[PDB]
Each structure stands twice: as structure tokens, then as C-alpha cells.
């Protein structure tokens, strides 16, 4: 139908149809008489998968022959979403498959909706890993994603009586056609035991063994015939495990629990033993695989020339002492040489400055689970602190500040400190964030080793986040400037010359309207909720957090409602306010915020005086597949974290690419987005980082704002008195108390500027032509935020490898 | 190479080769450069599986169209073994695949050895179910095997220091290419809860739900294009199961433990809750499937006309009250009508008279787990006992003897009594066994309902147990009488006219020698054990039991050794005595017997004076695949259970078909085997059932035999004094004590006749021509013992269906 979706050739369509029928018959063991939509989905998935394997085999053969430097991206999370459409897009098969299925009497879009998300992540960190894999393949790097194959991903969120309920994400129930089990490459991982010192070094003995079984998933590059691998480890008990008889077999579950479930925490550290086991499991299995592949190329001098290991946050930090363990205890290298190799191999990406997200593991846990690693960590610490003492003589407090070992009630190991010590490169994820690292939390480390500290501003893949989710926009862009921008997003700048083009303005606005209509239709069909498609779509989708300030959004919503009630017959720009996202199951305040949002909807959506001028909807079960639906439909993107708290954000970039305007604080990547688009084309409000610092030195008193802002006072009175919860008057007492007395994120301080700024948004929306012109200026300058740009910078400045757009032979 | 293995056509070989390469590439994601023997096995398995599916789909379509009466074979065990060669044989693909693999540079026999046994059974009972499935498909019956997909089958047996060690049979580790998961047909099963009585009947409420997910395996008939289904249920937790968060997800294992492991007990009842859950799980899921299929044909009058349910032992006995529950509580039928339907639908096969194998479930377990079923069982009992009282007025002890409820310290339900009450047909598994049932343990029930009681002598499939495991013998038979005997084993009688044929005598003896050479080679390669291929191969393979009397064999072995030591320079017929089989992990005496056998080998195999005249070998890890190797190699088959204890035996039939002579008591099917072959062609010894009864009335005193038999005395002295265990002199005290004071199976009483009979075996073996002539008379009269005969009798006399040899269109 549309150009960017590829060609539908006669030979191709015929071949796809016959292979579809072959899989339905031989693979699924069905005939057309009993086949369900799900069977049809699987037949198509297997048909498309066939096209990958030839390219997959030859790519990996190519790497074996050429022996390039290998990039190993270690992450506890890979938030992949659905795979079918992505694979079709990257293989240029979308139109041919659409035609083939059409001729078989099937609707491909209906089949696409059957696939479960691979929800092996919490949010931003896991989705960044997924975009990175896509860009690494597109840029022709010999890259491998390594993680854990969780049996259960991020929970499915149900809303019951306005409250979040959690249910298991049984994503593998019907099978996963994309993965290939590799039981032949199973590796042992050791836990517990004790350290024996001999004449020839230390030995780790009397351990318990868990097997790590790999499952490989293909990662196709964009139309370059490159297919890289994501290898995810699954936990298996050895066959002599605990070997009365029946109980011993049943107890195998204990070992296999390691890969059972993803911890559902976003930017929060939970110091549980199972989590530590997960972290070592991925690291130990992965490093064996790396060393095996390196030896199959004695001399570990060339190790850093052939291997790069990227640590996605501190979660895989145990790679540092594990690599030391293998090199010193098993390969018999001297400490100094092993350390040189380790430092030159490892690089670390920091994702947040927030204290509650920082991994600080109790010594007593490491002592029991990983006794040899603790000894190695102690030795690293001593040698590192000797360097600090020599560089800064007499500075005793610096020594305590920089130690990997934190003294206190319970001794802990600071994993971020471990990562900096054992990595040649440390990066933040946006310019402001990287500067904060050097100025605040890692200031001491920066003073010792300034050369280690870098910036790599985050990005998103334009394949999933434009071509896939918004084909209508991709097409009208391609009509003007060609197709090359899909792997060279900087070309979008060419759209600046169309800002006064009357045809383009109309087309951009048309695509947005169609997207809004399609999303409004989705809401009625799947959730029976009614929304006005002519209203401004005001959306905030992201994990529920105090720092992300869904609460500030709530206060604006109530302000709008109160203003309408005061002057019912005054015209206001109609809005649909949509808020979605999951709360960590144990995060009480976040769960209260979800209840607040639904409670506001209950009042606002049923007030006859409001009509269709204001609607508040909670978007249930926010996940990658839902993001692909709502983001193209958005008019206004809410990026309103307290300045200095959101390291980068990536949702912000997704909205910018898809024709929404942004209301936001000068936080994370918002700063660079405003810089690229021009501040006149961005709705910036509120405190800057410097203003927050000034307020902190003075002391934040929320009462001051309550006393001086009558509109804010009314809202707090409504919340406290039970306006939004008549049958439970004190339901929101926890929220009010937090706001008034212990608000670390200064919601009240940004309220006035936020409300004022929102008025300017409504004013612009009244002028459709000028709204759309500003949109064009945003889309046109979104190029910097391609993960292709990000990965090219990692490649050149950290990994020491050169990206390539050259095709492999098909 | 050989005729019975089919044709190797030019078109077929070319097509097999190309599909082999297709699967290696697209299915396994490998190329020839990195592929291992295991990869090659899987590529072949997938290639052969392809040939099944067309036939599988059309068979099941045929049943839907014709709507014949359906046979449901319910078993907790299906001892399937390997599937690759069996599938090739039944599809006439063996020679073509042999050719195709040969041209690819592969040895098919090497590839066959890679497949794991599907060891979902303990021994005879589970293997009977497997042979039955094969015969039902071969006879064109619309039959379904229903059971449990155990994650772990019967344990792998290792011998360490002469003792049995158990390890988990992780049979699914590399995947199972034969099964097809059917998650779309998942069904709920209920446990616990309570019974509420309403105005409209009883209701079972507040239950816990476990999901039953079916996996289907094709069962091909012999060259008739019929492919039936074996459906095995797997346990799955519902997604809201226990839904802090992490623990709730981990606790899903508790529900899924139901299908985790096969109870490793052979002819022994262990009254554990997990086992009861397994029994209800299979019954509840299966019955829903049956009723669904029946409705998709209100009127349950025709239910017995369209459905037969066969209970393999009492393990699935809960089918009776479950069917009543569904008909009364859910379909709202009156009790009397529901009962009439149930009785006419269900039939029960008894497998043993031994008291310790009889299922007697504590009432308190059923009360908690299945409260509604207990109420139904009580009601069945009351109505049944009212019939007994009316038939036998005043006979108060009969009422207590016949009750389904057994009073005592703990009240129990006798499941055998439940089965007889609720079945229209009850059968034993050999003539002597069926007569014992009517005379002894079920005498009361026979007096009330004589028409219910039948015999169905067991059998074995000649496909697996001749054509597959012994192609050399199958070929020389086919050369004389054609191929029709493979599905009409009675035709073997035609071989009686070749008993004086000098060419046939030579060929029969040649095939045996080749088999012995091949097995002697297997032993050296896989276990590094040396055996003399010119010796008499004396084998006893079966589960280790007191009743099966491996101990009597041990006593003969020691007698032979002592006799050689007394007269070293006297000629004796050289023997290799092989004993193999698993012991239940908790069965102390059986574990002691294994140790005894190895302990005897340790002395005998290393005595220089013995030389190669006597060797004692314990065959490790006896299972279906090993049976297929050792049985064709056997000269002498040991079937030496105490008269009245082995209900039938099936191993006996396997040896008879494969050219071994039998030494045995008049027990189980041995009686009918001797009747068929003629007693002159069988080595019969020892007490008959009548002699055991006489000894029991008198009282068995083992001391009498010890005192009167000097050779027996010597052995007991050797055992007690530590001749076979010098470093642990009293190691075998438990065995000696049992033999002397509490031997329920009268080992000493059959000793003299056994030893005498063994001398006659050695005498015959000295005359190769006369040995072989007797062998021919055994093979020629083994026809009755085909499971095709057995199944035809079930079909005509129990199920009310007519078997068919007619081909379905290919
Ligand atoms: O997931 C959480 C995130 C934060 C949290 C709070 C402020 C800044 C960053 C993270 O706090 C928590 C507190 C809890 O008791 C339980 C939780 O699961 C969380
Ligand atoms: O598997 C067993 C079979 C018999 C057994 C004994 C005599 C006749 C039939 C079965 O006894 C046992 C006793 C135990 O303590 C444990 C067991 O696992 C078994």
C-alpha cells in the first residue's frame, strides 16, 4: 500500500503463501478448517523467521572468519516488545506479507495483535538495551546482547476498583517462535562454598552448581542482511541435584528459580539474595562464553583488543571481580596484568543519581554466596585506596568517601564505586546528567581520573519508533526527502524547508488526526472507554514515580476542573488527559497515585457540566506495544520530573519524533531536545537545577506555597475533606501529608509556572496552522536522538570500533 | 539391505535427503560445519515426523466424519521407549531413510542411539499400555491414550560400589520432536474446597484450580495409514495464582509439581497426597475432553454407545465418581440413570493379587482433597451394599468384606472394590490370574455378579518386539512364509513345517549368534565389560522384587561356582548370567539384592580357576531400549516367580518371540506359553499354586530345607560368614534372616527342583541342533501372545467394537 513498507513482487507473494501453508500443516499440525487467528499468527511468524536464519548463519560465520573486536552488552533487562512487524520492516517484507495474507483472506494487523510482548524489562533501562541491539546490528557491529530469560517478565497490570492489581506475565505459554534453545552449550555456574589457599594460589571449593542454558534470539539490522544474537540464559538443576527420592526431584525448583521472574522495580534497589544470584548467574555464564570465543580465535594481552564488555548500570558489576577471578585463579595471570586487562575490557554506564537506586550489597550476603569474589573486592579496594592516598596525601575523609567498602551498622559494598575503579570509561546518559556526575556523586573519582568520564546522550531506534508505529508519518516524510533518513535520521533537518509548505502542513496534521481516530477506536473496542478525538491529547506515560511527578499533572487536572466549575459557560480548549504506567508492587506512594488518578476520573468524567471538555483516563497495562499505539496519537508530551532527577528519559524522544509538542522541565535530555529544536518551539517551565539547589540550601517549605496560592489551597482542601473519595474521606491523607511535610521533589514549587505554561499550550492549540508549524520544527530537529548516533559514539569513543552501513551478501 | 525394512525408491531417497537438509538449516539453525551427531538425529526425526502429520490430520478428520465409538485408555503410565525406528517401521520408511542418511555420509544406527527413552512407566503395566496403543492403531480402532506428561520419568540407575544410585531422568532436556503442545485446549481441574447443598442439588465451591495443558503424540498403526493420539496432561498454575509479589510467582511451582515426577514404585502402593493429586488430575482433565468430544458429535442415553473407558489398574479409579459427579451435579441427571451410564461406560483391568499393591486411600485424605467425591463414594457404597444384603440376606460378614469402606484404625476406601462396583467388565491378565481373582480376592463379587468377570491374556507388539529389535530373525522368517505374520502373528505356526529343515535350523542359530556378538560388542564399548560370546546367555531382566525371586537365581549361581571350585577340571557348559532391573528407591530388600548380585560377580568374575566358564554381570539401567538389545541376544529366559504371584508377565513373551528357551514356574502367562509350545519344549520346575497352598496350610519352615540340603547349607554359611563381603562380614545378614525366618515367597522350597532343571538346560545346550529345534517350536507357537490378539478380544468382548485391517487412503 505505502512505499516505505517495501515491494510486493509476484514471486515473493507466491513463495510466502506456500510456506505459510506448509507451516500451518507441518509445524502447527492444523488445517484451515480448525485453525484459529492464533494459529495463523504462528504460521506467519514461522514463515518470516525462515528468512532470518540464512542471514543469521552467514553473519555469525562472517564474524568467525573476519575475527573483528566483539562487543558484549550485559544487561539484566531487555525490553523487546513484539518481534513480528520489526522483523518484516528490517527485512523489507512488510508489503509482501500484507499481500500474501490478504490473498489468503487474512488481515495481517489482526494477526500482529496476537503476539505477546517480550516484557523482559521495567522501563527506560531495558528499552534502551533493546534500541541499542537494533542500532548495533544496523551499524554492522559484531555485538551480542547477554541477559536472563525470565519465565515471567514485568507483571500484567489490571485496575480493580481504581487500584493496581498484579498478575503473572506468562509470556511463554503459547511458545516463542523467535528463540532457539541451545542445550548443547549449557555452562556451569557456582554458588556458596569456601576458599582454600594453596601453594599455587586460592581455590574455590565445595560449591553448589546451577546450569546455565542459553536461548538465542536473532537481531536483524535495517536492510543490511546483518543478523546479530541476543543470548539469554535459563537456570537448570544438574541431574544429580540433591541425589527421599521424590522430594529431591521436586527441590530442583530451588535452583531453577534463579531465572523465574524479573524484579519489577524501576530505579530502586532491593537487596534480596535471589536478585544477587540473578546478577552473578548472568555474569558467570556470559564470561565463560566470552573467554571460549576468544580462545577459539594463552596470550591475554590481546584480550582488550578483541573484547569489549559494556555494563548496563551496576547490575552486572560482578563481571569485574569475576574476570579477575578467572584470570588470576584459573589462567594463573599475575594480579597487575589481570587488572590491566580487566580495566581495558570493561566500561560502565550510569543511569541515575537517585540514592535509592544505588546498589549497596551487604558484605554478609557476598561472604556466604560468593566468598572468593568478596576477597577479590577487598584487594581491589586496598590497591585503589593506595592510589588515592598517593595522589591526595593526608586527605583521610576522601579515603573514606571513595572506599568500595562502606562502614556502618551493616558493612556494604558500593557497586558503583567498584564499576568506576574497574572500568576504563564511565558515562552518563545525557549532558546535564554527565555533568552532575562529575560535580556531585562521583566528584572524588573525577578528580582522580578525569579521562574516564564521558557523556553518551541516549537515543531511540527510528525503525520501531517511527517506521513501525507511525507508517503514515514515515510515508509523508519519505515523499519529500526519500528513504535514507531511516538509517540516517539527521536527514530530517531537510524538513525545515517545508515549514511554510501548505501541502506538508496539511499532511502532517492529517496523519496526527488519523492516529488519534485509530487510538480512540482502540479504546472503545478493547476497554469500552469513550474519548473525543477533536480534543487535545495530553499524555504522560512512564513508570509511576514520585520523582516523575504524575502528582503535578494531577494538580493541573484538578485546577482545570475547578476553573470549569467556576465558569461553566466560558470556552476552554477540550482536553483528553491520559496517564499510564506501572507501579512497583511494594511502592505504596506510587500505588496511591494510581488510585488518585482514577478517583479524579470518577468525578470529572461524570460531571454533566464538564461535558466532553475534559476527560481523565488511566491507560491500563502500559508496555512497549501500548507505547507504539499511544505515542503516535499524542499532541502534548508531559516530561515534568524535578530538575536534576531524570538522568535522560527516552519517552521524551519518542514523542518528539511522532509529532507531539513537549511541556517539560530543563531535566535530562529535555535540555538537549530544546537546544536542537530551539527554546521557542518547546514549552519549558519551572525550576532549573540551580534553583532546586538554592531552595535546598534555604529549606523547602511547602506551606509557603499553600498560603500564597488560593487555587492550590482549594485542591488540598478537596483532597483532605474527601471530595474525590466520599465514602472514604481520609483515603488520600498519605498524599496530602507527603506534599505538605516531606516532599523531596518540590511539587508545589513548580505548580504556578506549570499551570501558566499549560495555558500557553491551550492558546497555541487554538491555532492549528501554528501548532503544526511548531510540530514540524520538532520532527525536523529530532535527528540527534537516534540510537544510531548514540551507538556510533560508543563505538568510536569507548569500544574502539568503526560502524559500517555496508550490506552483507544476501 | 533386508526385505522387511521396505523399499528404497529413487524419488523417496532424494526427497528425504532434501528435507533432512531443510530441517538442519531452518529448524535446527545449523550448517554441516558445526553440526553434531545429535543435530543429525533431530534433523532425521523432524523429517520422519513430517510423514506422520498428513496421516495424523486425516485420521482424526475421518473419526469426526464417521463418528465411531471411541475407546479411551486411561493409564498413569505409558512406557514408550524410543520413537524414531518404530515410526520408520510402521510407515515403511526404514530402508529409504537408511539409504538417504548413507548418501549424506551418516550411519543411521548411530543416530538412533541418540534418542532418549520416553520412560514414563515402571515396567510391565506401563509397557502393556504402550503395546496396546500400537495394536489399537494397527487394528484401526478410534482409540486415545490419556495420561500425564511427567517432566521426569523413571530414574536413571547408576551402580556405585555395587549399590544402586538414582538420578533424575531429564528426558526433555534437548526437546521432544514427537509431541505437539496444545495450549489452546487447556482445561481446569479443581482441588480442596467444600460441598454446599442447595435446593437444586450439591455444589462444589471454594476450590483451588490447576490448569491441565495437553501434549499430543502420534501413534502410527502398522502400514495402514492410521495415526491415533496419545494425549498427556501437564500441570500449569493459573495466572492469578496466589495473586509479596515475588514469592507468589515462585509459589506457582506448587501447582505445577503435580506433573513433575513419576512415582518409581512397581506393584506397590504408596499413599501420598501428591500421588492422589496425580490420579485425580489425569481423570478430571480426561473426562472433560471425553464429554466435550461426545457433545460435538443433552441425551446421555447414547453415551455408552459412543464411549468406552478402560481403567489400567485402579490408578484412574476416580473416573467412576468423577463421571457420576459431572452427570449428577452438572448435567442434572438422576442418580439411577447416571449410574447406569457410568457402569456401561467403564471397564477395569486388574494387574496383581499382591496385597501391598492394592490402593487403599485414607478417608481423611479424600475428605480434604476431594470432598464431593467422598460423598459420592459413600452413596455408591450404600446402594451397592443394599444389593448385596438383598441377594444374601443375613450374611453380615459378606457385607463387611464387600464394603468399599474399610473400617479400622484409619478408615480407608478400597479402590478395587470401587472399580468392580462401577464397571460392567472386570478382567485379569492371564488365565491362571483371572481364575485366582474369582476363587480368592474377588470371590464375593464374582458370586454376586458372575457375568462381570473375564480374562484377557496379555500380549506384546510384534512390531517393536520382533521386527524392530530383531530384523535378522524377522527376515529369515519372511523368506519362508512372507510378511503377513507381522500383523497376523498366528501365521508363525507355518514354521512348524521347517523344524527338520537343515537350512532353517542353521539360519535360526546364525541369527542368534550374530545377536550375541553384537550385544557382547555393546557391553565392551559402553561399559568396558568382557563376556564370552560362545557361552550360554542366561538372563533375568525385570524389576527387582522379592516375588520375582532374583534371589533364587543368585542361589543357583553360587551353587554353580561352588561345584566348579570342588571339581575344577570337570567340563561344564559355559554360562554368562545376566541380571538387570531397577529397585524402587525406598525398597530396602531389593536394594540389598542388587548389592548381592554385584558382590557375587566380584568373587566369581575374578577367580582364576573359573576362567570364562562362569560370568555374573549386572545389567545397569534396564529400560525399554536395553530390553531391545538384550532380549534378541538371550539363550535362556528366567521366569521364576513363586506360583500365584506374577499375574501374567510380558517379558516372558518377548523372550519366546526372540528365540530363547524358558526356565519357569507354572505362574502367570508361563502356563499358557507352555500350553501353546508343549510342555516338552519348556523347562518347567517347582511348586504349582496348589502346592504353595498346601505348604501355607502346613506352615512354611525354611529350616527344614537348610537341614536336608547340604549344598544350600554351604551357601547360607558363605553368606553369613562374609565370603562375599570380607570387609563387611555381616553385610547380608538381612537377606539371610529373611530367607531363614520370614520368606513369604518360599525361595528354599523351589531350590532343589530349580537346580535339577538347570542341569537339564545345560544338557540340551550341549546339543546345538536339538536346542535350536526346540527354539523353532517356541517361536512357531508364540502367535497367541501378540497384543493384536489381546486387543481384538477387548474390542469384541468388552468395548463392543470391530477391529479392521483396512487401509486408510494415503
Ligand atoms: O520502587 C520503589 C521506588 C522508590 C523510589 C522513591 C523515590 C525515588 C526513587 C525511587 O521507592 C520505593 C519505596 C518502597 O518502599 C518500595 C518501592 O518498590 C519503591
Ligand atoms: O516397592 C516396594 C515393593 C514392595 C513389595 C514387597 C512384596 C511384594 C510386592 C511389593 O515392598 C516395598 C517395601 C518398602 O518398604 C518400600 C518399597 O518401595 C516396596
Catalytic pick among A51, A70, A127, A654: A654
Shortest Cα distance from A239 to chain B (angstroms)?
Answer: 5
Active site residue B433: no
Q: B665 catalytic, yes or no?
A: no
- Which residues sit opposite B412 in a β-bridge? B362, B406
Nearest alpha-carbon partner for B84 in B172, B178, B175, B153 = B178
What is the SS3 assignment for A750-778?
HHHHHHHHHHHHHHHHCCHHHHHHHHHHH
Q: How many helices (H) and strands (E) does chain B have?
A: 33, 25
B-chain residue closest to A275, CA distance: B246
Q: Is B267 in the pocket of ligand 2 (CB under 6 A)?
A: yes
Terminal Cα distance for chain A, rounded: 25
Experimental technique used to determine this entry:
X-ray
CA of A674 to the centre of ligand 1 (A): 30
Class in CATH terms, B1-459+787-810: alpha beta
Nearest to B344 by CA among B315, B294, B301, B386: B301
SS3 B658: coil
Q: How far does A82 lie from chain B, in Å, by closest CA?
A: 20
Neighbours of B1 (CB within 10 A): 11
Contacts of B155 in chain A (CB under 8 A): 245
Backbone φ/ψ region at A668: left (φ over 0), alpha (ψ -120 to 50), beta = left
Which ligand has an atom closest to residue A122 CA? 1
Minimal Cβ distance to A26: which of B53, B174, B246: B53
Residue from A264, A321, A1 nearest A120 by CA: A264
Break-preceding residues in chain A (C–N over 2.5 Å): 243, 297
Q: How many residues does chain B have?
A: 810
B417 as an active site residue: the answer is: no
A155 CB contacts (<8 Å, ≥6 apart)? A166, A167, A168, A169, A264, A582, A585, B245
Apex B770 CA angle, B768 and B776, nearest 5: 100
For residue B245, what is its C-alpha cell? 509479589
Query: Which residue in the block uniquely carries the three cell numbers 492550590?
Result: A712
Rounded distance from Cα A259 to ligand 1 centre (Å): 23
Q: Is B254 exposed, middle or buried (0-12, 13-18, 19+ CB in 10 A)?
A: middle
Q: How far apart are CA B740 and CA B706, in angstroms?
A: 8
In the three-class reduction of DSSP (H, G, I as helix; E, B as strand; rest coil), residue B253 is classed as helix
Read off the DSSP letter of residue A644.
T
How far is A173 from A170, CA to CA, in rounded Å? 6
Active site residue B543: yes
A542 tagged catalytic: yes
Dist. CA B564–CA B609, nearest whole Å:
8
Is B570 annotated as ligand-binding?
A: no
Say how many Å lie between the CA of residue B587 and the centre of ligand 2: 5
In whole angstroms, what is the distance from residue B178 CA to residue A6 CA? Answer: 38
Best residue of B18, B23, B29, B48 to probe chain A, by most A CBs closer than 10 Å: B29
d(CA A258, CA B735) in angstroms, rounded, equals 46
Task: Return the CATH fold of A460-786.
Answer: Rossmann fold (3.40.50)
Q: List phi, psi (to 5°) of A236.
A: -135, 135
Bridge partners of A580, per DSSP, are A541, A619
> What CA–CA distances, in Å, run from A324 to A210, A343, A358, B744?
21, 10, 23, 65
Residue B267 CA: which ligand is closest? 2
For residues B521 and B561, is the Cβ–Cβ distance under 8 A?
no
If DSSP codes are grouped into helix, strand and coil, which group holds residue A370?
A: coil
Rg over alpha carbons for chain A, rounded to the nearest Å, is 27
Residue B165 to residue A243, Cβ atoms within 8 A: yes
From B122, B155, B271, B356, the mutation candidate for ligand 2 (largest count of ligand atoms within 8 A of CB) is B356
The rounded distance, in Å, linking the Cα atoms of A650 and A131 is 10
Residue B742 DSSP one-character state = -
B295 is in an annotated binding site: yes
For ligand 1, which residues put their CB under 6 angstroms from it?
Answer: A 265, 267-268, 354, 356, 546-547, 584, 586-587
Set of chain A residues whose Cβ sits within 8 Å of the Cβ of B26: 50, 53
Q: Please report which residue ranges of A67-93 form alpha helices under DSSP H.
A: 84-91
C-alpha cell at A663: 511541556
B285-294 CB burial, b ≥16 within 10 A, e <16: bbbbbbbebe
R_g over Cα of chain B = 27
Residue ranges matching CATH 3.40.50.2000 in chain B: 1-459+787-810, 460-786
Contacts of B385 (CB under 8 A, 6+ apart): B399, B402, B403
In DSSP terms, B163 is beta-bridged to: B160
Q: Report CA torsion sign: B175, B177, B183, B185.
A: negative
Q: Do B241 and A168 touch (CB under 8 A)?
A: yes
Cα B655 from chain centroid (whole Å): 15
A146 bridge partner residues: A74, A231
A145 CA distance to ligand 1 middle (Å): 28
B261 chain-A contacts, CB cut-off 8 A: 246, 249-250
- Name the closest residue on chain A to residue B177, using Cα atoms: A27
A294 is in an annotated binding site: yes
All three cell numbers of A137: 546490528
C-beta of residue B460 within 8 angstroms of C-beta of residue B757: no
Residue B297 marked as a ligand binder: yes
C-alpha angle with apex A39: A38 to A45, nearest 5 degrees? Answer: 90
How many angstroms separate the CA atoms of B67 and A706, rounded? 78
Torsion of CA B63, B69, B74, B79, to 10 degrees: -50
A443 in active site: no
Angle at which helices A588-604 and A550-566 cross, to 10°: 20
Phi then psi dihedrals of residue B232, to 5 deg: -115, 130
Q: Cα angle vertex A713, ends A712, A719, to 5°?
A: 90
Q: Which long-range contacts (CB under 8 A, 24 or more apart) does A511-514 make?
A: A511/A470, A511/A472, A511/A473, A511/A476, A511/A659, A512/A633, A512/A635, A512/A659, A512/A775, A514/A472
Residue A53: CB atoms within 10 A of its CB come to 18
- Chain A CB contacts of B257 under 8 Å are 250, 253
**From atom 16 of ligand 1, which residue's Cα is the shortest distance away?**
A587
User: Which residues make Cβ contacts (< 8 Å) with residue A282, sequence separation at least 6?
Assistant: A74, A76, A146, A147, A148, A233, A316
Q: What is the chain A residue with the closest CA to B272?
A: A246
Q: Are A329 and A203 in contact (CB under 8 A)?
A: yes
Burial of A679 (0-12, 13-18, 19+ CB in 10 A): exposed
Residue ID of nearest Cα to ligand 1 atom 4: A268
Is A297 annotated to bind a ligand? Reply is yes
Q: How does B206-215 read in b/e, with b if 16+ C-beta sit within 10 Å?
A: eeeebbbbbb
Whole-angstrom distance, CA of residue A733 vs CA of residue A739: 10
A516 is in an annotated binding site: no
Contact across the interface for B38 and A184, Cβ inside 8 Å: yes
Closest CA in chain A for residue B217:
A29
Catalytic residue among A5, A49, A277, A548: A548
* CB-CB contact of B719 with B732 (8 Å): yes
DSSP, collapsed to helix, strand or coil, labels residue A160 as strand
Of A31, A253, A261, the CB nearest to B249: A261
Q: Which residues contact B697 (CB under 8 A, 6 or more apart)?
A: none
Cell numbers standing for residue A506 = 496539511
Separation between Cα atoms, residue B310 and residue B456, nearest integer Å: 13
CA distance A516 to chain B (A): 33
- The residue whose CA is least distant from atom 17 of ligand 2 is B587
Amino acid at each position: 500500500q505505502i512505499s516505505v513498507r517495501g515491494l510486493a513482487g509476484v514471486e515473493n507473494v507466491t513463495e510466502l503463501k506456500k510456506n505459510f501453508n506448509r507451516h500451518l500443516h507441518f509445524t502447527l499440525v492444523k488445517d484451515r478448517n480448525v485453525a484459529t487467528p492464533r494459529d495463523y499468527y504462528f504460521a506467519l511468524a514461522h514463515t518470516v523467521r525462515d528468512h532470518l536464519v540464512g542471514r543469521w548463519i552467514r553473519t555469525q560465520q562472517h564474524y568467525y572468519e573476519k575475527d573483528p573486536k566483539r562487543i558484549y552488552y550485559l544487561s539484566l533487562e531487555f525490553y523487546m516488545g513484539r518481534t513480528l512487524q520489526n522483523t518484516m520492516v528490517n527485512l523489507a517484507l512488510e508489503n509482501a506479507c500484507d499481500e500474501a495474507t490478504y490473498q489468503l483472506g487474512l488481515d495481517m494487523e489482526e494477526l500482529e495483535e496476537i503476539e505477546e510482548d517480550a516484557g523482559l524489562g521495567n522501563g527506560g533501562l531495558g528499552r534502551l538495551a533493546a534500541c541499542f541491539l537494533d542500532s548495533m546490528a544496523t551499524l554492522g557491529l559484531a555485538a551480542y546482547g547477554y541477559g536472563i530469560r525470565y519465565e515471567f517478565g514485568i507483571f500484567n497490570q489490571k485496575i480493580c476498583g481504581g487500584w493496581q492489581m498484579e498478575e503473572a506475565d506468562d509470556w511463554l505459554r503459547y511458545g516463542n517462535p523467535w528463540e532457539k534453545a541451545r542445550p548443547e552449550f549449557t555452562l556451569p555456574v557456582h554458588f556458596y562454598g569456601r576458599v582454600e589457599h594453596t601453594s599455587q594460589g586460592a581455590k574455590w571449593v565445595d560449591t553448589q552448581v546451577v546450569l546455565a542454558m542459553p536461548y538465542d534470539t536473532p537481531v536483524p539490522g535495517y536492510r543490511n542482511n546483518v543478523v546479530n544474537t541476543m543470548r539469554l540464559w535459563s537456570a537448570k538443576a544438574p541431574n544429580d541435584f540433591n541425589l527421599g527420592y521424590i522430594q529431591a526431584v521436586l527441590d530442583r525448583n530451588l535452583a531453577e528459580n534463579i531465572s523465574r521472574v524479573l524484579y519489577p522495580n524501576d530505579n530502586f534497589f532491593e537487596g534480596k539474595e535471589l536478585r544477587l544470584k540473578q546478577e552473578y548467574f548472568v555474569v558467570a555464564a556470559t564470561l565463560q562464553d566470552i573467554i571460549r570465543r576468544f580462545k577459539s580465535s594463552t596470550n591475554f594481552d590481546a584480550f582488550p583488543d578483541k573484547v569489549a564488555i559494556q555494563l548496563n548500570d551496576t547490575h552486572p558489576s560482578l563481571a569485574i571481580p569475576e574476570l579477575m577471578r578467572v584470570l588470576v585463579d584459573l589462567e594463573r595471570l599475575d594480579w597487575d596484568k589481570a587488572w590491566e586487562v580487566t580495566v581495558k575490557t570493561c566500561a560502565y554506564t550510569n543511569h541515575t543519581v537517585l540514592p535509592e537506586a544505588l546498589e549497596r550489597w551487604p558484605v554478609h550476603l557476598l561472604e556466604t554466596l560468593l566468598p572468593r569474589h568478596l576477597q577479590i573486592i577487598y584487594e581491589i579496594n586496598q590497591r585503589f585506596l593506595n592510589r588515592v592516598a598517593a595522589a591526595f596525601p593526608g586527605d583521610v575523609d576522601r579515603l573514606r568517601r571513595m572506599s568500595l567498602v562502606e562502614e556502618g551498622a551493616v558493612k556494604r559494598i558500593n557497586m558503583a564505586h567498584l564499576c568506576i575503579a574497574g572500568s576504563h570509561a564511565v558515562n552518563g546518559v545525557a549532558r546535564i546528567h554527565s555533568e552532575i556526575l562529575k560535580k556531585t556523586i562521583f566528584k572524588d573519582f573525577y578528580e582522580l581520573e578525569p579521562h574516564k568520564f564521558q557523556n553518551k546522550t541516549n537515543g531511540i531506534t527510528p525503525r520501531r519508533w517511527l517506521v513501525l508505529c507511525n507508517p503514515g508519518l514515515a510515508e509523508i516524510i519519505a515523499e519529500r526527502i526519500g528513504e535514507e533518513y531511516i538509517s540516517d535520521l539527521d536527514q530530517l533537518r531537510k524538513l525545515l524547508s517545508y515549514v511554510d509548505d501548505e501541502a506538508f502542513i496539511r499532511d502532517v496534521a492529517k496523519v496526527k488526526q488519523e492516529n488519534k481516530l485509530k487510538f480512540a477506536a482502540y479504546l472503545e473496542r478493547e476497554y469500552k472507554v469513550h474519548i473525543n478525538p477533536n480534543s487535545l491529547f495530553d499524555v504522560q506515560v512512564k513508570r509511576i514515580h514520585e520523582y516523575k511527578r504524575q502528582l503535578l499533572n494531577c494538580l493541573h487536572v484538578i485546577t482545570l476542573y475547578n476553573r470549569i466549575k467556576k465558569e461553566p459557560n466560558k470556552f476552554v480548549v477540550p482536553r483528553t488527559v491520559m496517564i499510564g504506567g506501572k507501579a512497583a508492587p511494594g511502592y505504596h506512594m506510587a500505588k496511591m497515585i494510581i488510585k488518585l488518578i482514577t478517583a479524579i476520573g470518577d468525578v470529572v468524567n461524570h460531571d454533566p457540566v464538564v461535558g466532553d471538555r475534559l476527560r481523565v483516563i488511566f491507560l491500563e497495562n502500559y508496555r512497549v506495544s501500548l507505547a507504539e499505539k499511544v505515542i503516535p496519537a499524542a499532541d502534548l508530551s508531559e516530561q515534568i520530573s524535578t530538575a536534576g532527577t531524570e538522568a535522560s528519559g527516552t519517552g521524551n524522544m519518542k514523542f518528539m519524533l511522532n509529532g507531539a509538542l513537549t511541556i517539560g522541565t530543563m531535566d535530562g535530555a529535555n535540555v538537549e531536545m530544546a537546544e536542537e529544536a530551539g527554546e521557542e518551539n518547546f514549552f519549558i517551565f519551572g525550576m532549573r537545577v540551580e534553583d532546586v539547589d538554592r531552595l535546598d540550601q534555604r529549606g523547602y517549605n511547602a506551606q509557603e506555597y499553600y498560603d500564597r496560592i488560593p487555587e492550590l489551597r482549594q485542591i488540598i482542601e478537596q483532597l483532605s475533606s474527601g471530595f474525590f473519595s466520599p465514602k472514604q474521606p481520609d483515603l488520600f491523607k498519605d498524599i496530602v501529608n507527603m506534599l505538605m511535610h516531606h516532599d523531596r521533589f518540590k511539587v508545589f514549587a513548580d505548580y504556578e509556572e506549570y499551570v501558566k505554561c499549560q495555558e500557553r499550550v491551550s492558546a497555541l492549540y487554538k491555532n492549528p496552522r501554528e501548532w503544526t508549524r511548531m510540530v514540524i520544527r520538532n520532527i525536523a530537529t529530532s535527528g540527534k536522538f537516534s540510537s544510531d548516533r548514540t551507538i556510533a559514539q560508543y563505538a568510536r569513543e569507548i569500544w574502539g570500533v568503526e560502524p559500517s552501513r555496508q550490506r552483507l551478501p544476501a
